[PDB]
Structure formats: C-alpha cells, structure tokens
Amino acid sequence: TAGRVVRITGPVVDVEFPRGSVPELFNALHAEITFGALAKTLTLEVAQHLGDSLVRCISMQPTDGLVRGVEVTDTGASISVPVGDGVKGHVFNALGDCLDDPGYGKDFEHWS
Amino acid sequence: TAGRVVRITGPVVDVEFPRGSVPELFNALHAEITFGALAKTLTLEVAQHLGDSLVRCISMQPTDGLVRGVEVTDTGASISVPVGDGVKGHVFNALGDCLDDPGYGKDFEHWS
Amino acid sequence: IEGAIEDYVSSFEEIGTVIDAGDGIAHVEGLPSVMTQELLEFPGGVLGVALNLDEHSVGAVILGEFEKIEEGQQVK
Amino acid sequence: XXXXXXXXXXXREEIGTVIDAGDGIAHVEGLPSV
Amino acid sequence: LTNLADELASVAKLLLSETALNKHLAEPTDDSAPKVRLLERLLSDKVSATTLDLLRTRWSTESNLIDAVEHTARLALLKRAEIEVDEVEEQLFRFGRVLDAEPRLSALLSDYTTPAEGRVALLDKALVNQTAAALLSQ
C-alpha cells in the first residue's frame, strides 16, 4: 500500500507508489532515518508528479542518513499546524511542535 | 590485445580497451597517423574513465589525420622527461624530445 | 562469439548519407574510414570539414552554399 | 496470494564497483543499502 | 508456427543479451550485404531456415529492432492458435484481469531488472489455455 524512496539529491527525494495509491500535490509523507545520532522520523512534502507513478518531494529535516528503498507513508493531508488561543506564549518550529515544551501542540485543533 | 580509437573531437580522443586492460589515469598511449606528409606518432594522455572499458584522452599533437578504429598501445607509465646534469645546455619540447639534437636525452634517467 | 562480432565489424569507394542538416552544419552517417578534418564533398558541388567524429555519425561544417544540402543526400 | 508469496520466498558486506572516474568524482554501481 | 516462435524468442534473447552486437547491428546500411554477412555468420548454428529468412529483412533504433522480433513471434504463435481465437483471447484478458487486480503481483512481474529465467519459472508456477499461457511465457 505505501511507497518507497527511489532517488535522493540533497533536499529533493523522489518516491514511487503502487498504481492507485499516488498522493496529491502538497501532501505530507513520512520516511524513517535509522543511523545512530541522526536517527529521526523525516517529514517530506510532495512538489510534483513525474509520471509512471513517481512523485518528487522536498525534505523538511536534512536527508543525511536516508537510504534508497526505505518505506514512505502518505498521511493523506497537507502539513498541519496547531491553531487556537493556547498557541499564545509558545515557540513553534515550521511543522508546529513546541521547542520550549515538546509535544505541547498534539491536542490542539490543527489546520492545513 | 590493445585498444581502439572510437571518437575524435578536436584534440580530445576516446579510446576503447578490452574489459580488463584499461589504463590508469595519466598514462601515455601511442597512436599512428599515416595519411602522407602529415604522418606522425601521437601521444595521448588518459584524462577520464567513461565506463564500459572506455577512456577519454587528451592529445599532445594535432589530431588532424587521425581516423576512427586505429590501434592504440598503452605504455603503462605517465609522460616522462629526461633528467640529469647533462640536460643543461639543451632545448626540449614537452614530451622531452630535444629540438637541438633529435636523438639526445634518450639514454638519460626518465622521471614521470 | 565476441571475436566473430569484432571480425565482422572490421570487414566493412565508401559513401555516407546526410542524416541531419541545418544553418551551415550537417551530420553524416557511415564513412567508417574518414580522417578527422578530411574534406568531404556533397552532391551540389559543396564541400565540408569533418570536425567531430562520433561513435555512429560524423559532424561536418559546410563550406559554401549550405542551401543545397538536405537529409538523404549521399556524401563521399 | 499463496503462489506469489512462495515465489517471493524463492527469490559479509556490500560491494559496489566504480563505473566512471575523473576530476575527483567517481560513480559507483551497486550498494543498494548506502 | 510454434517452432518459428521459439526461434524468434530465443534470437530475441541473444539480441537483448549481446548488447555490443545489438548496438552495432542497429545502424542502417546502403546495401544488405554486411547485414546478411553477420546473419550467415551467427544464425546458422542454432536457428531454422524460415526464422533466418524472416530475420534477413532499416529500423530507427535498437529497441525497435528488438521489439520487431517479438512482434513477429507473437503473430506466429497466435496464427498457430487460429490455424481457438475466442479461447486464447478470453484467457488473455482474464490473465490481464488477475495482473491488474493484484498490484504487488504486477510489480513483482516487472522482471527486466531481475533474472528472467527465475521470472518465467515464477509466472509459470502462478499461472487454462496452453497457447495463452505460451504468449504470457513468451
């Protein structure tokens, strides 16, 4: 059901999906980085459709340590940000998680 | 067994060798031009490997009159020049051939 | 097998054909024995200089009226 | 399902090989896990 | 028809595997004489007279020259079935239905980047009309 990474060049990652599963433009995809100190989950935004079920994406965290053929899961929606009154007085990264109190945004209303 | 010329574009010449017989970088290769009044032995230097047993070379003489398919022989060493106290007094071209006495320096120590 | 394939490829009065032409340059197929910067001649009495010799075609600059050149002409 | 899963079942360190080299760049073939 | 399709499928395998020959024969000539020269040199030991006579026939590139051998072999084997047209067609659409309904099996069938012998074994073990299965194995 999910896709896999085909090509990597700097911040740009090409992914391939099963025949019907190809995600829309501006969906958030996930991929896993597994090496040591660089180990993180990577979030990855769809920029283009290249034909033949290929999709070209732009990475949010650095791609260092990513490997060809790793699984990629389509989240089915765009990148989402916590919005609400309790957002005031906190510091967020681009992806909407709080730097001064980790996990803080997980229970808010999220918008595209 | 030895290589063949396969592309020519000005002073750049591509040469194809047998699978296992590919020269290192900066080796000197000989090739023959046999047209007529223009005839000479070329020296080529290896500058790149292009894959599939093919190498790209730079010609030390005008390639004018070189024809596709001629045999090229790998000397197994870089371009060499005569060195010694007997080098003083004389005039040399880049290949270490003496212009003042054509046979001179052939018997001197040759450095790469 | 590969030695019989190479022996055959060596076995090839030779005439080429123009495969592309434009603006004062033309590409010739064939001529497996042409020298670099050999002077070619084309059917209209037009000459050319074989500058670039690729694996499968020869790139010739055209001297004089390149208007007389078209694809499928012979060259010698 | 069954026959395909059995055909997938029936289908040290990694080695690559240099396929191009020049000017301080080299292209390597293989290394599916790099 | 069956003998000739096997000769055309096997020479297509020699053409896709012999890449140096493929990239040299895929070039047009002013006469047939060299084209027949390699044809007499290499076709004589392992191929039938009809197959060689057909192969003796200019293509734009190597991929199209290789495809044209498969196309003749498909025509031959289908003419051999016709010499059962409804049963081969219906079975062949039905195999297309099985392949398009199972996207992991269709992707696992994409075997040009894999050993083709193990691919043909896997398909023959997963897959009825004998000639439809022959076209699929071809």
UniProtKB/Swiss-Prot annotation, chain E:
First-listed, main subcellular location of the protein, grouped into a coarse class: membrane
Protein localization: Cell membrane
Keywords in alphabetical order: ATP synthesis, Cell membrane, CF(0), Hydrogen ion transport, Ion transport, Membrane, Multifunctional enzyme, Transmembrane, Transmembrane helix, Transport
GO CC annotations on file: plasma membrane; proton-transporting ATP synthase complex
Protein origin, superkingdom: Bacteria
Gene Ontology MF terms in the entry: proton-transporting ATP synthase activity, rotational mechanism
Summary of the function given for this chain in its UniProt record: F(1)F(0) ATP synthase produces ATP from ADP in the presence of a proton or sodium gradient. F-type ATPases consist of two structural domains, F(1) containing the extramembraneous catalytic core and F(0) containing the membrane proton channel, linked together by a central stalk and a peripheral stalk. During catalysis, ATP synthesis in the catalytic domain of F(1) is coupled via a rotary mechanism of the central stalk subunits to proton translocation.
UniProt record similarity statement: In the N-terminal section; belongs to the ATPase B chain family.
Note: Binds 2-aminothiazole antibiotics, which are antitubercular agents.
Oligomeric form and interacting partners: F-type ATPases have 2 components, F(1) - the catalytic core - and F(0) - the membrane proton channel. F(1) has five subunits: alpha(3), beta(3), gamma(1), delta(1), epsilon(1). F(0) has three main subunits: a(1), b(2) and c(10-14). The alpha and beta chains form an alternating ring which encloses part of the gamma chain. F(1) is attached to F(0) by a central stalk formed by the gamma and epsilon chains, while a peripheral stalk is formed by the delta and b chains.
Protein name, per record: ATP synthase subunit b-delta
Gene: atpFH
Residues included from the entire protein: 199 to 347 of 445
